[PDB]
Each structure stands twice: as structure tokens, then as C-alpha cells.
Design a protein around this ligand. Structure first.
Ligand SMILES: Nc1ncnc2c1ncn2[C@@H]1O[C@H](COP(=O)(O)OP(=O)(O)OP(=O)(O)O)[C@@H](O)[C@H]1O
Ligand SMILES: Nc1ncnc2c1ncn2[C@@H]1O[C@H](COP(=O)(O)OP(=O)(O)OP(=O)(O)O)[C@@H](O)[C@H]1O
Ligand SMILES: [Mg+2]
Ligand SMILES: [Mg+2]
Lengths: 470, 55, 240, 478, 354, 121
């Protein structure tokens, strides 16, 4: 016996009364399939998620779609499990919504495919890896100044005009090429036009064949906008747990996850908290973030775009989000306009991993020296702009000479840039990049022109480019 | 000539210090403003919710 | 404790000292309980009966014809906010108040008493004396002017003040430092022993500093000394 | 005893609660005894919450309410063109019945992510300061934000008039304005001849809150009918802030859990629903597109409030208008610094794309070097020329009311300014030069005007410079 | 039966209400049908409010609840040394069960006025800056405060490592930390050999709020067992800020009116009755001691915030870590101006004073 | 008062002036009665129906073909905060706005009619 009936509708919040002794559990999914009996009704295809037990055999639920057309007393069916989404190779190259149904026009997934629950507890203490590993992304600036951690969380700061999508595509390409791991993109609260643009960009780049995309858009109800991140995370967890891979996960905007949670809390009628957020802010953020870890057989690594309300880094949502981050990447309009790609700020970007214990003494020293040199160059900008370069001290002249070489060598020619530039891409191992930066710092290439260092990849290509120009 | 050069050097250095002090003052005032903003929002919503659940 | 003291005040006619280590915890506990008793919350989450309960406690601590109770109460200020209802309501029940300040504490000035906010009904010319009253008013005036000069001094330095305002700053910094003192009980924090300064010596020292008799001594010589003579003692053997 | 009628228990403040109506749909439309309409919003266990779409004072406890069997819908059709209607579709211009034949529900799903197409066609606003720096394309949704009495309505009216020759249908939604203002606007549109392809939707301030809350949805519902059949539709909202205020009133009176600033939980859901229904349809679906221009009111220039922040996050771009800059002679008063349009480039013709590249850098340089302008008159290398050029730029950006400029003339004047031809003409002669230039061109530049209109690309450099130099010699310097 | 059995009538957000349970006492442990434990919080006229100490998805309205007859308590013993447990005393490292034979209540009275003694024994942290400028004695409550990424966890780990030769038992309580970080910390301690004398109590961020709320009390209850037998114990709380957040969440779910910064009124009593149980006992009481090092995280280095001021009012001094000074390369970035040790000086060896 | 003026407008076709002093008081009276009637207050403690009530009052002052009513209204500004809902809701109803600037008021120069903060259609 799994039949209940609608008893109360209050907008997105729907109350269902089940027979005693057959109440569905929390987070279970309920389905309504109503055909218009006569011309005074409308057809219903709506899915609900259990939120509370109100007593008197009543369940308070959150709707995953528009609730218009509901009538008190129609039949509701309990599925006996939380929302379940398909997993496996079938999800690669497809676009889904939160419910796990394909959005792209390519066709549906057969009912015999394997499906997994959205809600599950985080991995146990002893299932975790006991050591820190580096995720070699093959990008020079990221690998040198802000290394990535298998199982770590990385926040991405920037906006439009700074090639964020290009950087995402290159990360997907490099990871799938050198590690064999797939990536998953979760569009929480994404603008529909921007999502369409991103889909077309990925199809053009050819990475769509090795990624899965889940979209929860701004027009959808708060339940969907809150739960889409978890279905993306489940799609990644399948590959982490079964294939033992190194999988990338992209969360399109994690602030909208928190504000959708706040809206759901308000709808359920709980008291607000500081600056009006939900009482369960930290618990919800933790339940999302703690499933992105590195275990004994694989890992999930998350790149998350973060928005800062009112530019206040002390606001509770950014404050809670930053409690989980292990790295930071800032995209700078100055660099993007100047001509550096991927335009990662070499100074603002930070990483927890950049320590000799995790990375090594040589890499640590080289990174610190590069940072110091760039900082000094940043200092001399004003006196250059006023007095002139030849007016400087000799050592400052040498520093300015070397700093432009460093700034240009931090640039790279991405594979996904081939479709426009015509230049083949390059993957630079961290040993090659640290050696090249050591050579440049030691003054071995002070005679080459600075334009030889523009877009080369390894340290041999700058020599070859200078030799070809003259 | 020496005195004029010294005067312009003194102006440059002192005015640099003044601008730096202004920037630091702005930063601290901005932090205070953010704290006040958050406190005001919290108090407003708390009073509204109390007046709502009064019934 | 108040009942125990009231016995001696009334029945035996003793002069009684009463110390209360923190009277704010009383109202804090009242607020902790008030929610469960069914009362409605007040402005900042306090109980609606905040003023009445504190009044009913405070009016018992008074000096009558039968005996005299002098009470010294330490009051906590949450989040350094002097506009919080608990500190705001306690002000009307006191005769003399000393307002401690975190900013003065961080500058190394001890005790960190704000010289302007602190008040007393006993500062009248016919109670403390005309000379004492004049010196007190002049010190407060100088510190007020120095407080007003802070924005200009911070934004563009002392180099663009007038000659009189520079002299005001010069007096004010030394006076502010001289209000510090080395306590007996701070022996365990720093090895320097404490001091006891009579009121006549205090008045004479501040009068001398206002007259400019010690403009030449370094400002660091005035810190944590006590009598004005110790200022000269410290200026000597310090390198001057 | 039936399930299709009910009796009213509570009446007051424009809402009601009824016993019965056991088979009503959530969101259904209902009818009261005296004839006013209603909407069922809260379906409690034993009662129904009804908001009243009209004068509620005629309702008394104990009278009867009846089903209608329809989710709320509005009439659509080409007959609505040129009329003035309320959100229920009933005409208010007084020119007889509206004569429709078709209906479309208020709340319909937005186009899916796979049914859209990248924005590539330009929407000619006819304003230089917008078509130069802040492009708008068909299918784009752009936010126009400013303080009270800054010119937003004038900008909207200019845009709506400028679509005369285009194959576009314009819709104007008025929320919470004076009926006098609405009638003035209707008179202006009929005067300029724009009222033969325009629909006006009115929900004035004296009206009950639900009509204000429903007006923009009526507007989008009317637009979508033309959009889905392969046409281009432009929609204007006068006050999304008043929209939000009306929804707040309805929510609090229905006693839903209040959130920040007493706003209900799903206010962001409401505005996202409203502004995500504008898009550029893919070729398989049809060539149609819808573009939306919401307005937001700033209290003394504050842009961080809850509703303005929601709208800024939702839309694709912002145009900021300032009272002081309006007072300083900058009539359209666009603050080009912190305004932005995320769809720039694809929403511009080739000529405008070529001529507008330099202008932003010059304007930014003027704005950042203004520190040497008020306190100045000192020799310098850049600022002596940079501020001089920036002042000319700001003077050129200015425009007069109800005279949209064609895109080709905008291209020509921007080319002239960016090539330094204004560098000697006096700043108070700049606008005179601009007027004389248009007057000169209309007769002596056909081979440029028609070439631009036909090819969307800049003319020949030799011919263009020759014509400009001829006029420049013809010019008189005061 | 409704005397020692109950029935659930409401479930939500980690809070449950049960009908029946006539003889249950306030603060008793109640066991649900599926093995999840709860604590009887409010005994109303007809229903009992139960706070669920675990995953509440498997609990359904109509489920049976059983009394246990025991006040909220945790197991203690020497068998617990070297293990990692959740606040209820169940191991999570996967090395088998814990063979303790006796327990102690979570809520226990603090030592009285006449039971205590002056602090006079030095606790060596092995950090030159702390041991020279801001010394710490056994029985002291010292606060470590600073923004994120300032080395607070590293300071705690160094202190725990340095106790290898001193007679000391270390208890590291992790509230709201990431499980990856807790795993790495455990591995560092194991490599350096600190698990001869250490207990690790963890309640990660994914756990429900009541476990975060309970964890520090479980830690101090574990410490008190050794403390009252004449031994010396050190207890570290990874941060009381996250416990305060968990308690605020729980209170707002119970619909108690909030105060300043939406915190409940009893947020001071939450920490005072925890930090008052660390003390240096007298000779008659046995001479044992318990030293506590709570951590508090600030926003932009503001020490005037509600929680930082509350905790400063309780402890015997604080060590302030300077964020930009840490950014400048001096990793133990102690702001000497704002750091003070009230009961120090007497708690320092003669050589270091000179 | 408005009812008294509407008769002169409609019935006799005259032209009328309606002087209303302290609109702010009219708003505050409703803000007080709302709490007593027991409704959840708005953002700054005002009533939920502030805009609706103010519109239903203001929109009756119009010029029709029968006659015209012109209204001059004084508004006290609470603590000089122009962002208060009472003046904010008024701005969208006035054709001409005169601002009595406090800067001119307190420097001794009256009538403190701001020559440049004033706006007029
Ligand atoms: N381009 C322009 N040229 C000349 N006058 C202009 C221009 N733009 C705006 N104005 C003038 O600015 C004033 C305010 O403009 P408008 O009536 O559009 O106000 P608004 O900002 O839309 O205000 P409201 O909030 O009342 O809708 C009017 O007097 C109008 O004539
Ligand atoms: N004494 C030290 N010497 C060298 N490096 C240090 C020292 N203390 C901290 N660090 C470095 O700074 C990092 C800060 O991490 P740690 O967890 O110790 O600080 P925290 O402020 O307590 O962090 P959080 O609260 O965010 O977990 C360490 O991982 C290490 O790389
Ligand atoms: Mg307008
Ligand atoms: Mg730490």
C-alpha cells in the first residue's frame, strides 16, 4: 500500500496525507500522474520530495516543478527511495535536469539502466586516503603558483571576458588526456542563454564526448535549484567509486545553492538566522562538500565559482564556503587585456598545497622567488610611468628586464585554442615548468627577446621561437 | 634652486603619506560599514519574525 | 549578598562596603530564563521586565539614616557596545561611573579609564575645591581638543597644524600618559611595585603640567609613575 | 452540498477565505456573487485562500463563490494592437469591445535550453550613448536602472517609437503609475504614430495589489503569442520594484512566513519566472524572439538592495542613469563606467563595431583623469589632450528628446569624433557641429548612407574622409 | 505500554517528539527502533522532545522508542588511548571495539572554590615564542584566536607532540573540521609517535548539529576521568565557533527567540559550564589538573565580536595570531600586543624568567 | 477634505485647491492602526498596505473634463532620510517637487528653497 492523497497546497509546499503505518521516509520522492478526467481539469506530472513529518499521518513536501493545477484529494504514489539518476557511460555527452531526465533532444535512457540515490552519507573515516597528492593539470601558472590537490576544493574568482570557459575546457581536456578521468559540469542557477552558449562551446571543442552536464536553471523552483548539485555529485561519485578514476566536478555557482536553501527554509517556515539565512546553512554546505574527497581508490576534485554578495567576504555564505576551500584562482581583466592567457593572477592566487612538505624544496623556492620578482615589478610601475625606465637603478633595471620574461612565460597555448589560433596545444609537466622558471631566474636567457616567451609551453620552444625570428 | 628642489621633494613624500593614510582609513571604515550593515539586517528580520509569530 | 549586608546596615548601624564582581550576569540570567516563562522578547532579545527587575534590586542598595552602604559594582559591556540595553539602563542608578576603554588598554595606558565619559556628582567647586575643579575642567577641555584633532592628524600629520594646536597636542599627550598609574596588584604582571598618590599631589602635578613646567621631558617619562617627582626621576637615567 | 460552490468566511484587505470548493484547482480563477474575479492561492485543509481582483468592499461574509474551471489566462491576438487593457484583458481606453478569439495561460514554461539560439541581431534603440557603448540585441534581456525622475520612461518611449520601420511589435507595461502619466504616454505614442503596432497594459496605483502583481505576466503572455509564430516582440516593465511591493502585500496578507524585508520566500522565483521567458528561438522552432527591458528604482542611488540585486543577477546587462549627470546637461545621462552589456559585439553591425572600439577607452580615460580637470590649467602631455578629447566625447553623447538617430548617422558621427575632427571645434560648438553634420549629410552623403544601410559595413575611407573634410571646411566656428 | 516505551509523533530537522514515556527523566538517553540514540530534552505534559544524535532519515512517525535508564554519559578508560571515536564513544578508525568498563555523565558539576589550587607547574609547548612571552601552566584555560589559515591547528599539534616525555595525556577534539584534515592530523600524530598517549574525538561537518554540540563535553568528560585520579590532561577544541553555530541552529529549530547576532540567550552558559571544568585541583583532591586550549575563529581579525568577547571573558588569557604577519613569513605570528597570560609568570621555570 | 473638494469639482465645474499638511501623519496613522489590527509589519515597521492606501488616496486628485483639483502637500522628512517608505512612495505621485534643504535652513539663509535639488515636470 503506497497511495496517499493531496490535502493541502501552499505554493511550492505540498502536504500529503498517507494511511497510518505506511508513511514514507524523509527525502523520499513522491510522484503524481493525473490525467484530466473532464474539461475542468489539467494534466499533472509532478514530483515531490519529503521534508518533514507533521504528525497526524501527514507529510510536508517540496515540489520539483510548478504546482499549478493541483486539486485536493488526488492520488500520490511513494517511490520508496530518494530521487534516482542514471549512472555509467550512458551519462557521458548528455544533458540532464535535476530529476535525472535527459534535456537534450537525443533521446531518453532506458528504464533498465542503473540508478543511484541522490542522498547518501559521506564516506567513512577509514575509507579516506591518508596522504596528500598533487593533481597535475598541465597548466604552467596553476601547477607552479597554485597547485591543485586530489580531493581538494578550488574556488574560481572572475567573471566575463577573462576566459573562464576556456580555462574550464582546457582543464577537462588535460585531465581526460593525461589521467583518463572524466569531468562533470553542474549548472546551479545558471542563466539559460549562457548554458546554451556553454553547450555549443563544448560541442565545438570536442570535450562534450567525455563530460556530463546537469542544469538547474534560474526559472525552476527552489527545490530543483537546491538539489541539482547533489545529482551532479552522484554522477561523479559513480565513477569515483566504481572505475577508481580521478574525476573533475564543476559547480557553476555555489552561492545560488545556499540562497536556494535559504528560500526553501523560509518556505518551510523555520526561523531565520544571521542576516536572514537558514539555520542549517553550515550543515547543508558540509553535507554537500564532504562527499568531494579522495578515497583509497580514486578522487573527486571540485572547481567552484563563488559570488561574494555586496563584496563582503565576511558574509555568512562566502564565510562558510571558504571554510572548505584548499586553493584559489583569480582571473584578471588587466592580464586578459594585456594578452596573457589563461590570465591567472600570479600574485592574488593562493594555495594551501604550496609548502615544502607537500610539494618540495626546489619548487617552493622557485615559486617564492617568482612571486617576489613579480611583486617588485608591481612596485616599480609608478616610477616607470613617471620617470622612465632608463632612470632606474641598475638592479631594478635587471629586475624589470626579468619580470616581463616571467610574465610572458606564465602564458600558455591551450589545446582548445587551436580551433581559432591554428597553433597546436601543449601539456607541460610540473618538472619541466619548474626547471624552465629556474633557468629564466638564473639569467640564462636574458639575451632572448621577450616576445619569444609569449606562448610556448616548454622551455625549449622559447629558444626555438627566438631562433626562428632571428 | 636647491631649496626649490627640496620643497618639491618634501611635497611629494608628504602627499604620498597623506594618500596612503586616506586609503587605510577608507579600508577600516568599509569594514565597520559592513559590520553595521549585517547587524542592521539581522535586527530587522528578527523583529519582523517576532511580530509575525506573536499571533 | 545584599540581604546579608542590609542586616548590618540596619540593625547594627555599621558602615558597610559592598563589592559586586559582575552585576551584568544578573540580567543575563534573567534573559536566559525569560523565554521559557512565556514572556515576549524585547528590543535586543532581552526580557520585557529588564528595567523593573534591575530597579527592584538597585533601590535596596542605598544609604539611610540608620547606616551607610557604599557599593562598588563592576558592569560588563557586551561587544563593547555602550548602547546595549543592559549597560544603558544601569547608568541611571549610579552616582559616579568610570568607563574603561579597549583602545586605551591597547595603547598600554592603565587603568584604561576614558577621561571624558567618566562622571561623578561629586565634581562641584563647593565639594572638591575651586582649584581642583579648575584643574579638572582644564584637563578635560585639553583632552577634548586633542580628540577633535585626531582626524586631521591621522589624514595629513601634525605638520599642517597651527602653533597653538601643536602646543595643545604636546600638552595633551603628556597629560594622557600621566593619567596612567602603576597599581599595587599589578606587581605580578610587571615587577614594578605600585604607588599611592594623594589628591593634593595629583592636583598639583596636573597644574604644573598644564602650566608647561615639564614641556621638555620626553612623553615616555610620564608612563606608569604616580607622583610628578617620579616623572623627573624617570626622565633622568633614561638618557636625558 | 456540492463541491463546486462555497461560502465566504473572512473578508478584508482584498483577500478572502471560503468554505467548500472541494474540487478547485490550485491557481484557478473563481467568481464572486457581485461579479468580481478571484484567484485561489492557498488550498488549506478546510478552507481556500482567495485574492480579489477588484473592488472587494461589495463582498460580505456569507455570500456565495463559484468555480470557473480555468487556470488564469489572458486574451491574445492581433486585435489587441493599439488598445489599452488591464491585466485581465478588459479594455480601458473606452473604444468598445476588444474582439479577441484566443487565450493563453498566464504561467507557461520557459523555452528549454535546447530551443534557444545565440543572440546575433541588433535592436536599434536610436540612442547614441546606448548603441555605441551598451549594445542591445534581439533576444537579450537588459536592465535599465536609475533613480526617480531620471529619464527611464523617456528612454523607453524613444525606443518604442524608433521601431517604426522595423518588423517588431512593442508592448509597454505600466505598474503603479499615475493614470495621468499613462494617458500622457498613450497620447505621445498616438501622436508619433507608434500606437498601430503597440499594446499597452495598465495597472495603476489605486488598483488592488493582485492586478499589479499580475500585470507583467499578462504582458509576457501577450508577447509570447506573437513570439511563437515567428515574430519579434519588445516588452517594457515600468516598475519591477512596485511589482515586488504588490507581491509582498499579497503574501503578508495571506500570512506566509516572512523573509528578509518581509518579502516572501519565492520573490527571486517570481522575477526569474518573469525574466526567463524572453529568448531568441532556435531556427527549428521559428525565427521569433522576445526582448525584455525591466526597470528598477534606486533609493538615492543605492544598488545593493534585495530586489535590485536579484534583478541585476538575473538580467544580462545594466544601464545606469544618474540625477546629477542629468542635471549636468547629459540628457540621456548614461554612466558608461559601471553600466555593462554582456552580449556586446554580436548585437552590433560591423560599422558600429569598428567605430565604437576607441570610444570606450577615451571615455574611461576622461573619467579617470577628471582629477586634473576641476583643479588644472597646467601643462601636461596626456591630460592636456586626454581631458580635451573626453569633454568632446561627453558633449557628443548628448541627445534631445523624441528624435531617434538612425544607426548609420550614429556611425558617421562616432567616426568623426573618434578620428579627431572635433579636436579644434569649441566645446559649445560641438553640438552645433553635430546638428550641422546631420543636416549636411542628409543631402550630400547618399552614397555613404545607402551604402551603410545596404552592406552593414563602413564606407570607403577616401570618400568618407573627403566628405567629412568638405563639411569641416563648410563649418562655422563661433 | 507507555511507561518505559514511547511512540514518535513528529520528526523533522533532527528534532523528534514522542508520546508516552511517563517515567523518563530529563537528560536520559532514549534508544530508537533502528539503534539511533537520542536525549530527552523537554518533558512536557503529554509529549517528550527528543534530540536525535545521528542520522534521522531512518526514523519515521509511529516508530517505537525505548528508555535506557541512563543519564547522558560516555565511556572512559585507559583502553581509549590511541583510538579515534565519535562523541558517543564509538570507534571510527575501524580497529575493533573499545573495552572500557565504566562511564561518566556529560553534565557534571565543576570543582568548587575550596577544591582548587593556584597554578604553579609549567606546561612546555615547545614553541619559543609562546614559552617565552605567553607561558601556559597546568590547569590554565588559554585561548588561541585568529583568522583562518593562521596555523592554529599546527600550534595544537606541536603542543601535543612536545608532550612525549612529560607526563601528560592529550585529547584532541575536532568540531566541524573536514574529515580529510582530521585523517591527515591523525597520521601526523601516528608518525611522530603521539598516539601512545592521545585520544582523538571527531565530529565532522557532515554530521548532524547535535553531535557537534555534544563533542566538547564528551572530550572534557573523557579528560575528567584521568583528572580525578591524579593525572594531568590536556584538552584541545578545534574551534568553539562551530559548536556555537551548531547550538544556534538547534535553538532556532526549537523556536527559541534569538538575541544578538541571532544567537540564543544561553550561548554564554554553553561555554562557561564547559570551560569551568578545567582546573588545578588541591592536594586533598589529588593534585591532578586539566588544561584547555579552545580555538576561536574571527572575521577580518575583529576581536570585538560577540563570541570572541564571550570566550575572552571566560578564559585566563589569549594568544592572538596575526594574519598579515603570518602572510609575511613569520609563521608563528603572535601579536605580542594583544596576547596576555594572566596566570603566567608564576607558571614558568626560573631559567626562562631571567 | 478630499470628499469636500470633489463636490466643487464635479458638481459645479469649478477649479479647486486642496492644501494637505503632513502627509507623513496620514501614513503614520495607518502604520499605527495596522499593528493594532494585528498584521505583520513591513520593512521599517510600516503597514503592508502602505502603497495601496496611498494610491487610493492620491489618485483621486486629478483634472477631468468637468474641472480640476490642484493639491499642495507638505511632507515632514523623518530624520532627513529620503529612503523612508513614506517619502519614497510619495515621489512617484508628484508632478513638482520642492526640497527644503537643511544645509540652507541651518546656515541662516531662508526660505531654504533649494535652487537645484528641486525638480519639476
Ligand atoms: N534625452 C532627453 N532629452 C531631454 N529631456 C530629457 C531627456 N531624457 C529625459 N529628459 C527629461 O527628464 C525629465 C525626467 O524624465 P522622465 O519623465 O522620463 O522620468 P523618469 O526618470 O522615467 O521618472 P518616473 O520615476 O517618474 O517614471 C523630464 O522632464 C524629461 O523631459
Ligand atoms: N609554524 C609553522 N611553520 C611553518 N608553516 C606553518 C606553520 N604554521 C602553519 N604553517 C602553514 O600554514 C598552514 C595553515 O594551516 P593550519 O591548519 O595549521 O592553520 P589554521 O589557521 O589553524 O587553519 P584552519 O582553521 O583553516 O584549518 C599550514 O598548513 C602550513 O602550511
Ligand atoms: Mg517610470
Ligand atoms: Mg586550522
Amino acid at each position: 500500500m503506497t497511495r496517499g492523497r493531496v490535502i493541502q497546497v501552499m505554493g511550492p509546499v505540498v502536504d500529503v496525507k498517507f494511511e497510518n503505518g505506511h508513511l514514507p521516509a524523509i527525502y523520499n520522492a513522491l510522484k503524481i500522474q493525473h490525467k484530466a478526467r473532464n474539461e475542468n481539469e489539467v494534466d499533472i506530472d509532478l514530483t515531490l520530495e519529503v521534508a518533514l513529518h507533521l504528525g497526524d499521518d501527514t507529510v510536508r513536501t517540496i515540489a520539483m516543478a510548478s504546482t499549478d493545477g493541483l486539486i485536493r484529494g488526488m492520488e500520490v504514489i511513494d517511490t520508496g527511495a530518494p530521487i534516482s539518476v542514471p549512472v555509467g557511460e550512458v551519462t557521458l555527452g548528455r544533458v540532464f535536469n535535476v530529476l535525472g531526465e535527459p534535456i537534450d533532444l537525443e533521446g531518453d535512457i532506458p528504464a533498465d539502466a542503473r540508478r543511484d540515490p541522490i542522498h547518501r552519507p559521506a564516506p567513512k573515516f577509514e575509507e579516506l586516503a591518508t596522504e596528500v597528492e598533487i593533481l597535475e593539470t598541465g597548466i604552467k601558472v596553476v601547477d607552479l603558483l597554485a597547485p591543485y590537490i586530489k580531493g581538494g576544493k578550488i574556488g574560481l574568482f572572475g567573471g566575463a571576458g577573462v576566459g573562464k570557459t576556456v580555462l574550464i575546457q582546457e582543464l577537462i581536456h588535460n585531465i581526460a588526456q593525461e589521467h583518463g578521468g572524466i569531468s562533470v559540469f553542474a549548472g546551479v542557477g545558471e542563466r539559460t542563454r549562457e548554458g546554451n552558449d556553454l553547450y555549443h562551446e563544448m560541442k565545438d571543442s570536442g570535450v562534450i564526448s567525455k563530460t556530463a552536464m546537469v542544469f538547474g536553471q534560474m526559472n525552476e523552483p527552489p527545490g530543483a535549484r537546491m538539489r541539482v548539485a547533489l545529482t551532479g555529485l552522484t554522477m561523479a561519485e559513480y565513477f569515483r567509486d566504481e572505475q577508481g578514476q580521478d574525476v573533475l566536478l564543476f559547480i557553476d555557482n555555489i552561492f545560488r545553492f545556499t540562497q536556494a536553501g535559504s528560500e526553501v527554509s523560509a518556505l518551510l517556515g523555520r526561523m531565520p538566522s544571521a542576516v536572514g539565512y537558514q539555520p542549517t546553512l553550515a550543515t547543508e554546505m558540509g553535507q554537500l562538500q564532504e562527499r568531494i574527497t579522495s578515497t583509497a581508490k580514486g578522487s573527486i576534485t571540485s572547481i567552484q565559482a563563488i559570488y561574494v554578495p555586496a563584496d563582503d567576504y565576511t558574509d555568512p555564505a562566502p564565510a562558510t564556503t571558504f571554510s572548505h576551500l584548499d586553493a584559489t584562482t583569480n582571473l584578471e581583466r588587466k592580464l586578459a587585456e594585456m594578452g596573457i592567457y589563461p590570465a591567472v593572477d600570479p600574485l592574488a592566487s593562493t594555495s594551501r598545497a604550496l609548502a615544502p612538505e607537500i610539494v618540495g624544496e626546489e619548487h617552493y623556492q622557485v615559486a617564492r622567488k617568482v612571486q617576489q620578482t613579480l611583486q617588485r615589478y608591481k612596485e616599480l610601475q609608478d616610477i616607470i610611468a613617471i620617470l622612465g625606465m632608463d632612470e632606474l637603478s641598475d638592479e631594478d633595471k635587471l629586475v624589470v628586464h626579468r619580470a616581463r620574461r616571467i610574465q610572458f612565460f606564465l602564458s600558455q597555448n591551450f589545446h582548445v585554442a587551436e580551433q581559432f589560433t591554428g597553433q597546436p596545444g601543449s601539456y607541460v609537466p610540473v618538472k619541466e615548468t619548474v626547471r624552465g622558471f629556474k633557468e629564466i631566474l638564473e639569467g640564462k636567457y636574458d639575451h632572448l627577446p621577450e616576445d619569444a616567451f609569449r606562448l610556448v609551453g616548454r622551455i625549449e620552444e622559447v629558444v626555438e621561437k627566438a631562433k626562428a625570428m632571428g | 634652486l636647491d631649496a626649490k628642489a627640496s620643497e618639491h621633494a618634501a611635497r611629494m613624500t608628504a602627499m604620498k603619506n597623506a594618500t596612503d593614510n586616506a586609503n587605510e582609513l577608507i579600508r577600516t571604515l568599509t569594514l565597520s560599514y559592513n559590520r553595521a550593515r549585517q547587524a542592521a539586517i539581522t535586527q530587522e528580520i528578527t523583529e519582523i519574525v517576532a511580530g509575525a509569530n506573536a499571533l | 549578598g545584599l540581604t546579608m549586608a542590609e542586616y548590618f546596615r540596619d540593625e547594627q548601624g555599621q558602615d558597610v562596603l559592598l563589592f559586586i564582581d559582575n552585576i551584568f550576569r544578573f540580567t543575563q540570567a534573567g534573559s536566559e530564563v525569560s523565554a521559557l516563562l512565556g514572556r515576549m522578547p524585547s528590543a535586543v532579545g532581552y526580557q520585557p521586565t529588564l528595567a523593573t527587575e534591575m530597579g527592584q534590586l538597585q533601590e535596596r542598595i542605598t544609604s539611610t539614616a540608620k547606616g551607610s552602604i557604599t557599593s562598588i559594582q563592576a558592569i560588563y559591556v557586551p561587544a563593547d557596545d555602550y548602547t546595549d540595553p543592559a549597560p544603558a539602563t544601569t547608568f541611571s542608578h549610579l552616582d559616579a561611573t568610570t568607563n574603561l576603554e579597549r583602545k586605551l588598554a591597547e595603547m598600554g595606558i592603565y587603568p584604561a579609564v576614558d577621561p571624558l565619559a567618566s562622571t561623578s556628582r561629586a565634581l562641584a567647586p563647593e565639594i572638591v575645591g575651586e582649584e581642583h575643579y579648575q584643574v579638572a575642567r582644564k584637563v578635560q577641555q585639553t583632552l577634548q581638543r586633542y580628540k577633535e584633532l585626531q582626524d586631521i592628524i591621522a589624514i595629513l600629520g601634525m605638520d599642517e597644524l597651527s602653533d597653538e594646536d601643536k602646543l595643545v597636542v604636546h600638552r595633551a599627550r603628556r597629560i594622557q600618559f600621566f593619567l596612567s598609574q602603576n597599581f599595587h596588584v599589578a606587581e605580578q604582571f610587571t615587577g614594578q611595585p605600585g604607588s599611592y598618590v594623594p589628591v593634593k599631589e595629583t592636583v598639583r602635578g596636573f597644574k604644573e603640567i598644564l602650566e608647561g613646567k615639564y614641556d621638555h621631558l620626553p612623553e615616555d617619562a610620564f608612563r606608569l609613575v604616580g607622583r610628578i617627582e617620579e616623572v623627573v626621576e624617570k626622565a633622568k637615567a633614561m638618557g636625558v | 452540498q456540492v463541491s463546486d460552490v462555497g461560502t465566504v468566511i473572512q473578508v478584508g484587505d482584498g483577500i478572502a477565505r471560503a468554505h467548500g470548493l472541494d474540487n478547485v484547482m490550485s491557481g484557478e480563477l473563481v467568481e464572486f456573487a457581485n461579479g468580481v474575479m478571484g484567484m485561489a492561492l492557498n488550498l488549506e485543509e478546510n478552507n481556500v485562500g482567495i485574492v480579489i481582483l477588484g473592488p472587494y468592499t461589495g463582498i460580505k461574509e456569507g455570500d456565495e463563490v463559484r468555480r470557473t474551471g480555468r487556470i488564469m489566462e489572458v486574451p491574445v491576438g492581433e486585435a489587441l494592437i493599439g488598445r489599452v487593457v488591464n491585466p485581465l484583458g478588459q479594455p480601458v481606453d473606452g473604444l468598445g469591445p476588444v474582439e479577441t478569439t484566443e487565450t493563453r495561460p498566464i504561467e507557461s514554461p520557459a523555452p528549454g535550453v535546447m530551443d534557444r539560439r545565440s543572440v546575433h541581431e541588433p535592436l536599434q534603440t536610436g540612442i547614441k550613448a546606448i548603441d555605441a557603448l551598451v549594445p542591445i540585441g534581439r533576444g537579450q534581456r537588459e536592465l535599465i536602472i536609475g533613480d526617480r525622475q531620471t529619464g527611464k520612461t523617456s528612454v523607453a518611449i524613444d525606443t518604442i517609437i524608433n521601431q517604426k520601420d522595423q518588423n517588431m511589435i512593442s508592448i509597454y507595461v505600466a505598474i503603479g503609475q499615475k493614470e495621468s502619466t499613462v494617458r500622457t504616454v498613450v497620447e505621445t505614442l498616438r501622436k508619433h504614430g507608434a500606437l498601430d503596432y503597440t499594446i499597452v497594459v495598465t495597472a495603476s496605483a489605486s488598483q488592488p495589489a493582485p492586478l499589479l502583481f499580475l500585470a507583467p505576466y499578462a504582458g509576457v503572455a501577450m508577447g509570447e503569442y506573437f513570439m511563437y509564430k515567428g515574430k519579434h516582440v519588445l516588452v517594457v516593465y515600468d516598475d519591477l520594484s512596485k511589482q515586488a511591493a504588490a507581491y509582498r502585500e499579497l503574501s503578508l496578507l495571506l500570512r506566509r512566513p516572512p523573509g528578509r524585508e518581509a518579502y516572501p520566500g519565492d520573490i527571486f522565483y517570481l522575477h526569474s519566472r518573469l525574466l526567463e521567458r524572453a529568448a531568441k528561438l532556435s531556427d527549428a522552432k521559428g525565427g521569433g524572439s522576445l526582448t525584455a527591458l525591466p526597470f528598477v528604482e534606486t533609493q538615492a542611488g543605492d544598488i545593493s538592495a534585495y530586489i535590485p540585486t536579484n534583478v541585476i543577477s538575473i538580467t544580462d546587462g545594466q544601464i545606469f542613469l544618474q540625477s546629477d549627470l542629468f542635471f549636468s546637461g547629459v540628457r540621456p545621462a548614461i554612466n558608461a563606467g559601471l553600466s555593462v552589456s554582456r552580449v556586446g559585439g554580436a548585437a552590433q553591425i560591423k560599422a558600429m563595431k569598428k567605430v565604437a572600439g576607441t570610444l570606450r577607452l577615451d571615455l574611461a580615460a576622461y573619467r579617470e583623469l577628471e582629477a586634473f580637470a576641476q583643479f588644472g590649467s597646467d601643462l601636461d602631455k596626456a591630460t592636456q589632450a586626454k581631458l580635451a578629447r573626453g569633454a568632446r566625447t561627453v558633449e557628443v553623447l548628448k541627445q534631445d528628446l523624441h528624435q531617434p538617430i538612425p544607426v548609420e548617422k550614429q556611425v558617421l558621427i562616432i567616426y568623426a569624433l573618434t578620428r579627431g575632427f572635433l579636436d579644434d571645434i569649441p566645446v559649445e560648438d560641438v553640438r552645433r557641429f553635430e546638428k550641422e553634420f546631420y543636416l549636411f549629410l542628409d543631402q550630400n552623403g547618399q552614397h555613404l548612407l545607402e551604402h551603410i544601410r545596404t552592406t552593414k559595413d563602413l564606407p570607403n575611407e577616401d570618400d568618407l574622409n573627403k566628405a567629412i573634410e568638405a563639411f569641416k571646411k563648410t563649418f562655422v566656428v563661433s
